[PDB]
Design a protein around this ligand. Structure first.
Ligand SMILES: Nc1ncnc2c1ncn2[C@@H]1O[C@H](COP(=O)(O)OP(=O)(O)NP(=O)(O)O)[C@@H](O)[C@H]1O
Lengths: 621, 317, 96, 325
């Protein structure tokens, strides 16, 4: 039974592997889909000896360059327990390092810093394997990793967040082990010692009080009396007030005092992060701008700058406490969709390409992001336009409060009433006039609007498939030169925002009144609806590849960050399959492309669903 | 408050309840209801207490005494509550909120905890009482009317329209028919089997009634069961005849001018002791008492600063 | 020879420059020859042309700039656009 | 620093006085003199400095037409402003030469962005007039912009018709289909004219509607022309050539030539070279399509020299066409 089924799978799979390898060799570049197919077969049935032998033959025959497209998946399976699969991946990664180590170093550099012992050992083994030919590259990459971790989150932010969360664990949760475990590594941060002028300044400014509070903590450990811990937390709260006052003042960061090594770097052979392509000359890094702008957001992301050896400058965003591995995977999915839309002639005509930005995660919780130039976040655009017109920014929300000062307590239909009045009493024409004014002339403006509508349709519908959430005006950007919409956050995926207790969203995507008004006058039914029809046609036609990519997503614990997690992943993949096939709404029935698109537009535009969303989500906008 | 035989209650978003005399339309007194707006206002059969539903809690005030404070307050529910019902003797109370649970309560004891709970898949909204007082008819956001037996828990459910939120519930005093509406504006009716102690309460479908296009959110029968009035978010209300369910009535507050339109939904209605006069809410900060036969203005209850939501209106000689 | 369509792929500007002649010079013979060349090379697919190939700033700033500050900006922008072109020395004198 | 030079309104109005500009040369010359006078009379010293190079270099004059006009217009009195507004209305209405009309449209579009507000033309800020002229001059993006402004001011089936026409001429079939969907949603009572499907390129539905209208009423020039256009687009050479034969026997000479323009294609489709010759002879000599038809004729009679001459004439006309689009 089980063995007979395994034999059946093997004898249907080996031909599959061989055929995929031959097809990949034949395609030469438009083979991302098939690459994921073979990766799926590899990671599922690779361990069988015949399948592994076929894989080895294919690896020998296949051109190495193809594997670049799926380095993130490969290293995601670097610590696969199955010994044969792991051995073959190790050989493949060693070859990739020998040929194109630039494409491989960064995720491997992450894997070296992985807390997992198996991943740590495998990454170090593979690193020393490439060292014999790329010692300089590996050393520079590791130093960049460490130094950009240093820059991304400084001891000030580390300690602010540590004290805040630990205080919440005490006064909120009372889990002694919680705060003490949280603080212990943060204490090791100084007991390893400072290494930069900013770290030394933090030491001389606060580390004395931190050391005293840690002494009080040890006193509480040995004794347990509340007095010692009370003094420890008094000191912690004092330094917390001081550092919290300091933090708004740190509107920028000078590299000389923050990380002298990065400033010293010059004429490196390391490629600019997320810009290496074997079919192009390597863009080597020779600069790190001394200044780094810090954005006032709660996460305090840094703005970094590099100079390409070619004579071109690059900008990057640098974030900490975000697992940008999910962002990298989503960006690869969008690249897959770009290939899909370029392959289909109907979409090929109309330029449905998704705007994407290079994402280079360089830690389990911190990473980089390609900074896209000439992009204005929707919230900034609306704010600027209203300030120019002197319209009060939250005029809609102010009206909502004016009729219903206690809106959040209203039932559903009361909310619908107040929201409908707020929409009606306000013109809600800001974005159309804004696209008009920003444009130089109607000839340019029309191309901008066409690209805007088509890009919004494409990315909205792909986000519905992906279950993208919290599409609030700070997560949408307009490209001034082209007008394409750009989505800049994927922390929430797979309807996760639709299940959280705090304002569970109930719209598959953002299609509020203002975006629709920004379209042609006959907004939804023209460019947007036809483009959504085309996009769902493309994505359901090739649903298997997208399903494979989302399987690579779910089967790692990222979205839940074991049997319960497997159940959740199975359910998420089932929902995505329903979305792709049409069984999302009426599971018993199957909905054609126009029917599902119309249902989605109705759900996303309906005031009943819009009103339920967080006011900060700006549903009225 | 009970000096006049007829007592009218009203409330809005200003967190202040107000009382009125029907015929004269004269304000009797104001009352403070803060920490939440007013969802449902109801008067117990004894007319000695009024219940106002808000967020997470329900607050009761007294009628016999003028200028009291909240005499009773029930808490505990984790979501907004818009449903109220009482037994004819004033002993039991029945409520239900968006937390998907409908609760029973004892009014003549200190049972601050719910006597029983009935859960449904979707959030619950306005509930009504079978005149035998042994069965509750409940509307939810999924579109499923739930008939739940208080005594034997004989439970049935029916979805008349696919996955559309239904917000209304009321059954005629004769128990002969039941009716409801939903967000689509359609009105639905059903016939009731003549079983008081049969405990099966079998229903029979009746033809759909597209009463309105906008959100139809109210439904009430007259004390004599002659009429069925439903409010609707087209700032309108329509009254149908129980015998034939043919519409000859209209209660519109439309300004007529298209620019001034969308003034405010018709938010509630209540029949007089003979079906002649109707007292109805309006989110234009107002409530109005009209004559059903003529459907004309006869009195308006001004004074609110913020929109009205619900009314309580009782007739007695 | 039959070296059709391929010229666009190899040499993208080849297309645009051709159209520029239809705007630049006035000789009917040259323009007719340009039309015949464009025909012989074939009516390239506009998407293929875009693939081959891959004031505005003044107006955008004008949307922000005041008039008094606006006029010198355009004056110098156009002046320098003329100035950079090295084929206009006799104009460069009045430009300076 | 320097003050604002005082605008001489007399010369400004004199320059805009195109009462006696007729030919293309006259209108181009008027545009040149207008731009130069605007630079000369501009209040901003930098523009008046640029005037000399503008005179020595016409594109310099063209580049700063907008800014110079803005300076002068801001420097004018309300009454003088209205007089100038009337004069520019006359300038727009006088003749639809591509260059002058495009320059004026660019002026209006420029001043739309300006904080002062668009030019207060007679009633509708120029929306109707500017849209019409832009459509006439194939600056179709401006036409769409102003037509959408009309739509915002209130939708009518005529506005939808023009919107579909512009979108089609703007190579945006999906937007046109969206306009049709909106019309059906909000104007379903209005039967959709066959011309709409004709522009949207659902030739089947257009042909069905034209067949219906023919059943109601025959011998209507517009209806026949539209039906046979649908036939050509569908490639129905047989029915096209038939209906061409009867109507050609029965239809007036001007409509006969308009129909012949594509009855020639019908003759190609069926190869009836005699009917081809008849229809082509009906088509005017100095016409691009007619020139090509005469070329293919001459090559069917092996008159190579005549074919080459027709090719040269058609290439001149196509040169005009390219210089347009
Ligand atoms: N990929 C990107 N390309 C260009 N600009 C970007 C990109 N990502 C972020 N930005 C800009 O940087 C800002 C950072 O804010 P955000 O992206 O919200 O950071 P965050 O750490 O998620 N903060 P918040 O979401 O407000 O808690 C954005 O609002 C944009 O202005």
């Amino acid at each position: 039974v089980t063995e007979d089924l395994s034999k059946t799978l093997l004898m249907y799979t080996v031909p599959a592997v061989q055929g995929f390898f031959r097809s990949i060799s034949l395609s030469r570049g438009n083979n991302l889909q098939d690459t994921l197919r073979v990766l799926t077969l590899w990671f599922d049935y690779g361990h069988w000896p015949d399948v592994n032998e076929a894989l080895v033959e294919g690896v020998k025959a296949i051109q190495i360059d193809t594997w670049l497209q799926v380095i993130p998946q490969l290293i995601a399976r670097i610590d696969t327990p199955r010994p044969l699969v792991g051995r073959l991946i190790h050989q493949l990664l060693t070859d990739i390092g020998r040929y194109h180590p630039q494409a491989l170093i960064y995720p491997l550099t992450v894997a070296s810093k992985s807390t997992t012992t198996a991943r740590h050992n495998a990454a170090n083994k593979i690193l020393k394997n490439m060292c014999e030919h790329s010692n300089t590259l590996v050393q520079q990459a590791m130093m960049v990793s460490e130094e950009l971790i240093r820059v991304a989150i400084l001891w000030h932010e580390m300690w602010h967040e540590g004290l805040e969360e630990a205080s919440r664990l005490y006064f909120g949760e009372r889990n002694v082990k919680g705060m003490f475990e949280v603080l212990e590594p943060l204490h090791a941060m100084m007991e390893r010692g400072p290494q930069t002028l900013k770290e030394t300044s933090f030491n001389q400014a606060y580390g004395r009080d931190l050391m005293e509070a840690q002494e009080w903590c040890r006193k509480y450990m040995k004794s347990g009396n509340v007095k010692d811990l009370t003094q420890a937390w008094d000191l912690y709260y004092h330094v917390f007030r001081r550092i919290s006052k300091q933090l708004p003042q740190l509107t920028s960061l000078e590299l000389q005092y923050v990380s002298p090594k990065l400033l010293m770097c010059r004429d490196l052979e390391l490629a600019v992060p997320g810009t290496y392509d074997p079919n192009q000359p390597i863009i080597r890094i020779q600069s790190i701008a001394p200044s780094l702008q810090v954005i006032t957001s709660k996460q305090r992301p840094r703005k970094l700058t590099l100079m390409g050896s070619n004579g071109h400058e690059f900008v990057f965003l640098l974030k900490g406490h975000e697992d940008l591995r999910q962002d990298e995977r989503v960006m690869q999915l969008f690249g897959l969709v770009n290939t899909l839309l370029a392959n289909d002639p109907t979409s090929l005509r109309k330029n449905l390409s998704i705007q994407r930005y290079a994402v280079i995660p360089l830690s389990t919780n911190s990473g980089l992001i390609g900074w896209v130039p000439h992009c204005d976040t929707l919230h900034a655009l609306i704010r600027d336009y209203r300030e120019k017109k002197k319209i009060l920014l939250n005029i809609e929300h102010r009206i909502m409060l004016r009729m219903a000062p206690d809106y959040d307590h209203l039932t559903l239909m009361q909310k619908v009433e107040v929201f409908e009045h707020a929409v009606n009493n306000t013109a809600g024409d800001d974005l159309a006039k804004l696209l008009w004014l920003k444009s130089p002339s109607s000839e340019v403006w029309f191309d901008r609007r066409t690209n805007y509508t088509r890009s919004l349709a494409v990315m909205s519908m792909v986000g519905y498939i992906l279950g993208l959430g919290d599409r609030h005006p700070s997560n949408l950007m307009l490209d001034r030169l082209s007008g394409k919409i750009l989505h800049i956050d994927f922390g929430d995926c797979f309807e996760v925002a639709m299940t959280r207790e705090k304002f569970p969203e109930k719209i598959p995507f953002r299609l509020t009144r203002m975006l629709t008004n920004a379209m042609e006058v006959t907004g939804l039914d023209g460019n947007y609806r036809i483009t959504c029809h085309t996009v769902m046609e493309v994505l359901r036609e090739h649903k298997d590849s997208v399903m494979a990519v989302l399987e690579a997503f779910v089967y790692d614990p990222l979205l839940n960050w074991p049997e319960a997690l497997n159940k959740k992943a199975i359910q998420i993949i089932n929902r995505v399959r329903d979305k792709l096939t049409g069984r999302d709404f009426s599971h018993d029935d199957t909905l054609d492309v126009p029917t599902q698109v119309e249902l989605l537009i109705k759900q996303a535009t309906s005031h009943e669903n819009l009103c339920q969303c967080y006011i900060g989500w700006c549903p009225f906008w | 408050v009970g000096s006049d035989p007829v007592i009218l209650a009203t409330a809005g978003y200003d967190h202040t309840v107000r009382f009125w005399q029907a015929h004269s339309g004269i304000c009797t007194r104001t009352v403070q209801h803060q920490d939440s707006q007013v969802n449902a206002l109801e008067v117990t059969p004894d007319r000695s207490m009024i219940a106002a539903a808000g967020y997470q809690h329900i607050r009761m005030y007294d009628l016999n005494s003028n200028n009291p404070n909240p005499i009773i307050s029930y808490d505990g529910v984790n979501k907004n509550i818009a449903s109220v019902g009482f037994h004819e003797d004033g002993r039991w109370m029945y409520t239900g909120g968006e937390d998907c649970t409908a609760r029973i309560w004892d009014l003549r004891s200190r049972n601050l905890q719910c006597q029983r709970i009935f859960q449904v898949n979707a959030p619950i909204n306005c509930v009504c009482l079978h005149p035998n007082q042994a069965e509750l008819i409940v509307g939810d956001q999924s579109g499923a009317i739930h008939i739940w037996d208080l005594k034997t828990d004989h439970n049935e459910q029916l979805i008349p329209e696919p996955e559309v939120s239904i917000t209304s519930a009321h059954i005629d005093p004769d128990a002969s028919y039941m009716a409801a509406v939903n967000s689509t504006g359609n009105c639905y009716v059903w016939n009731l089997t003549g079983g008081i102690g049969d405990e099966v309460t079998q229903l029979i479908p009746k033809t759909k009634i597209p009463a309105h296009t906008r959100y139809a959110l109210q439904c009430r029968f007259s004390p004599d069961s002659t009429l069925l009035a439903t409010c609707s978010a087209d700032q309108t209300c329509k009254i149908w005849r129980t015998s034939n369910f043919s519409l000859m009535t209209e209660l519109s507050i439309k300004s007529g001018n298209p620019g001034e339109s969308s003034r405010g939904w018709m938010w509630g209605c209540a029949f007089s002791g003979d079906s002649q006069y109707i007292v109805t809410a309006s989110s234009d900060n107002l409530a109005r008492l009209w004559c059903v036969e003529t459907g004309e203005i006869k009195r308006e209850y001004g004074g609110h600063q913020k929109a009205v939501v619900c009314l309580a209106f009782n007739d007695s000689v | 020879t039959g070296y059709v369509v391929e010229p666009y792929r190899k040499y993208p500007t080849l297309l645009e420059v051709l159209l520029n002649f239809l705007k630049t010079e006035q000789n009917q013979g040259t323009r007719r020859e340009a039309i015949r060349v464009l025909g012989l090379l074939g009516a390239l697919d506009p998407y293929k042309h875009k693939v081959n190939i891959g004031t505005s700033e003044m107006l955008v700033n004008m949307g922000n700039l005041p008039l008094d500050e606006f006029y010198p900006a355009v004056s110098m922008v156009a002046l320098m656009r003329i100035f950079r072109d090295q084929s206009l020395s006799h104009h460069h004198t009045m430009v300076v | 620093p320097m003050k604002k030079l005082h605008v001489s309104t007399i010369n400004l109005q004199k320059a805009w006085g195109a009462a006696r500009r007729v030919s293309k040369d006259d209108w181009l010359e008027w545009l040149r003199r207008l731009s130069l006078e605007l630079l000369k009379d501009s209040s901003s010293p930098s523009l008046r400095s640029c005037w000399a190079l503008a005179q020595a270099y016409n594109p310099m004059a063209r580049d700063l037409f907008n800014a110079a006009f803005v300076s002068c217009w801001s420097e004018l009195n309300e009454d003088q402003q209205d007089e100038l507004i009337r004069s520019i209305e006359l300038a727009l209405t006088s003749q639809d030469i591509a260059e002058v009309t495009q320059t004026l449209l660019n002026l209006a579009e420029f001043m739309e962005h300006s904080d002062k507000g668009p030019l207060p033309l007679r009633d509708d800020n120029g929306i109707v007039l500017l849209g019409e002229r832009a459509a006439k001059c194939r600056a179709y993006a401006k036409a769409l912009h102003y037509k959408e402004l009309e739509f915002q001011k209130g939708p009518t089936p005529a506005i939808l018709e023009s919107l579909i026409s512009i979108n089609n001429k703007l190579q945006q079939p999906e937007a046109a289909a969206g306009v049709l969907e909106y019309a059906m949603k909000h104007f379903g009572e209005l039967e959709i004219q066959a011309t709409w499907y004709e522009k949207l390129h659902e030739w089947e539905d257009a042909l069905v509607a034209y067949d219906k209208k023919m059943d109601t009423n025959k011998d209507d020039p517009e209806l026949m022309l539209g039906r046979m256009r649908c036939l050509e687009a569908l490639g129905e050479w047989g029915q096209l050539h038939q209906q061409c034969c009867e109507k050609w026997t029965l239809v007036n000479d001007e409509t006969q030539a308009k129909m012949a323009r594509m009855a020639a294609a019908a003759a190609w489709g069926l190869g009836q070279w005699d009917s081809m010759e008849e229809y082509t002879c009906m088509i005017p000599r100095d016409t691009h399509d007619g020139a090509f038809y005469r070329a293919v004729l001459a090559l069917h009679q092996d008159l190579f020299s005549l074919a080459q001459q027709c090719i040269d004439k058609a290439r001149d006309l196509l040169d005009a066409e390219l210089t347009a689009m």
